[PDB]
Amino acid sequence: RARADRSVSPTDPALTYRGAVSLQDRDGWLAPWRAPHEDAYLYFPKGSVGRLAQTSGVRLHLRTDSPWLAVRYEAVGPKPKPGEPQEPALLDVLVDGELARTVELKLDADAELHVDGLPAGDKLVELWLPTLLQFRLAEVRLEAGATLEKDTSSKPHWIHYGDSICHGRGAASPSRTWLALAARAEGLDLQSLSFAADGSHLQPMFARLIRDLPADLISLRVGTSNFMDGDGFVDFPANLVGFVQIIRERHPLTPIVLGSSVYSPFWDELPADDKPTVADYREQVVKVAELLRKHGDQNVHYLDGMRVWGPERGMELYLEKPDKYPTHPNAVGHEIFAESSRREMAALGVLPVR
């Protein structure tokens, strides 16, 4: 701390929040949201709403010559029902695309993060916000006399929707999720609309959101989340067709990747019980993709989730210990998933983007 220090508002025009749909101003605090905060009620029931403010795939960009930075923050974890736990809260600091500092965050408190010893000279600073938490800012501080410039990069936009799991789980740190690794290797401006199982039911409000967002590449992975509720199979093809058509109103030529669910050791292996299976959902993703293509859509493609993450993926790539069901990839698993997704999307001809 010093009087001379340069104080920066979280709403300063030189700051860019990437991966955020809206920014909520609440009594001196700035909360990035992954849906329009004023309309949150439209997307989820009251309890579930908090998930929209979790800063997964959200990053703060700024150009500065400052050898240090300080952020006044508050990190709020999800409210647990009485069966109390004991998931490290990390914030990544990238300098010119390279990881400079992984910072351990203080929870449910008005706290201050201080990253000293950053390279001297002009550089792009990316603060990759925590993955399973709501993160709010009140101030950014830099060295006195330090420069502050907007990051003017115009990377192609990549929107990812779907999955039945939280992507922050098992990743080494926020910039090391499969999504973060895949976007960074490709040079893409990521936007995650992944809100685990509940948010992956092909809700028309999410399709409207995707449609109203800038996008150069769109990927949707669905199926299993609907299977998990045992309800949604009959309407599934109509909901998926409807979902793509809404997006196509504003993205008529943008590559849309229709992903069938990735292999789940738990869900894929459940006994059929004359009820639709995970395999049945995967076959519908295929059918809709062929139907859209057959009637003129040259920019709709099918991505087999078994090719991205199949049954051949060993325990060495899962986080969960033997007495639990393997559900999440570990740090190496997140790297494999990322390279595998890039390889499969390149095979479809959607990668590279520019």
Side-chain angles (χ1 to χ4, degrees):
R1 221 86 159 74
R3 301 181 204 99
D5 292 351
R6 193 190 172 155
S7 182
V8 181
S9 165
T11 61
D12 188 288
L15 314 182
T16 307
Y17 294 84
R18 306 239 194 230
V21 171
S22 60
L23 313 157
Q24 182 186 59
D25 167 308
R26 187 175 145 90
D27 300 313
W29 297 82
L30 196 277
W33 283 71
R34 289 190 293 137
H37 66 91
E38 57 277 69
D39 302 327
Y41 69 99
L42 259 2
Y43 299 85
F44 269 138
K46 292 191 100 138
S48 234
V49 152
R51 298 160 87 132
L52 278 352
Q54 284 173 15
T55 58
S56 205
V58 178
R59 55 258 181 251
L60 173 64
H61 288 209
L62 57 98
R63 294 194 58 84
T64 197
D65 65 354
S66 181
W68 64 270
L69 77 71
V71 180
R72 188 172 163 210
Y73 73 95
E74 192 192 13
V76 191
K79 270 100 253 288
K81 36 232 92 283
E84 205 101 286
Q86 16 67 232
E87 44 177 343
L90 305 167
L91 176 308
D92 281 352
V93 184
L94 269 69
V95 172
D96 298 330
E98 281 184 73
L99 179 61
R101 198 81 34 95
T102 302
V103 187
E104 296 174 293
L105 298 174
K106 210 219 161 294
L107 291 197
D108 311 311
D110 180 348
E112 208 194 268
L113 166 155
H114 184 99
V115 185
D116 205 338
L118 290 178
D122 196 40
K123 69 214 164 252
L124 170 60
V125 184
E126 313 163 30
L127 262 43
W128 284 72
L129 306 198
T131 49
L132 306 152
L133 260 46
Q134 291 178 34
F135 185 91
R136 319 202 187 103
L137 310 77
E139 197 193 1
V140 176
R141 275 167 47 239
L142 308 166
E143 187 85 288
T147 63
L148 176 62
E149 299 183 301
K150 194 189 247 118
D151 166 39
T152 51
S153 288
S154 260
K155 281 177 200 300
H157 294 272
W158 175 31
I159 308 183
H160 179 77
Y161 172 84
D163 293 294
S164 45
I165 60 161
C166 309
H167 299 314
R169 203 91 91 269
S173 60
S175 67
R176 287 179 284 169
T177 63
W178 72 266
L179 272 174
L181 261 359
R184 290 164 66 197
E186 283 305 323
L188 301 166
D189 187 342
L190 170 69
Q191 174 72 62
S192 170
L193 295 175
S194 265
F195 309 101
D198 297 350
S200 322
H201 280 57
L202 302 164
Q203 292 93 321
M205 286 302 296
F206 285 121
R208 291 176 80 258
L209 189 51
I210 295 166
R211 179 200 59 195
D212 300 329
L213 250 19
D216 295 282
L217 202 225
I218 303 157
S219 50
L220 316 171
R221 216 195 332 274
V222 292
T224 300
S225 312
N226 281 106
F227 165 80
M228 288 171 63
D229 281 313
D231 193 86
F233 190 69
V234 178
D235 296 341
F236 192 79
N239 294 157
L240 186 44
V241 160
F243 204 91
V244 166
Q245 294 320 101
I246 291 160
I247 289 169
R248 281 273 180 255
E249 293 164 2
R250 312 234 273 140
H251 304 299
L253 269 22
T254 304
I256 297 171
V257 179
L258 248 42
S260 55
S261 292
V262 128
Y263 174 84
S264 162
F266 181 77
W267 304 101
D268 275 90
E269 307 307 341
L270 288 188
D273 186 64
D274 229 291
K275 181 219 134 169
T277 68
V278 175
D280 291 333
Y281 280 90
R282 294 211 186 84
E283 208 196 340
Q284 302 286 57
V285 180
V286 184
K287 284 186 187 283
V288 165
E290 288 169 356
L291 177 84
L292 269 26
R293 194 157 204 135
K294 184 194 134 187
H295 301 84
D297 204 331
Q298 301 185 259
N299 301 294
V300 180
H301 309 276
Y302 173 68
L303 189 69
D304 186 6
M306 305 291 270
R307 295 188 49 84
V308 177
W309 186 270
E312 69 309 304
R313 246 44 128 141
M315 210 64 105
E316 63 175 55
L317 307 173
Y318 283 94
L319 168 73
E320 299 64 36
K321 54 259 99 247
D323 54 294
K324 280 89 171 196
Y325 295 90
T327 52
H328 302 97
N330 50 36
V332 165
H334 276 273
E335 284 173 83
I336 302 304
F337 197 103
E339 242 60 289
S340 191
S341 299
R342 286 177 63 227
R343 177 196 349 99
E344 293 306 316
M345 287 176 126
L348 299 168
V350 306
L351 251 38
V353 184
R354 270 194 195 186

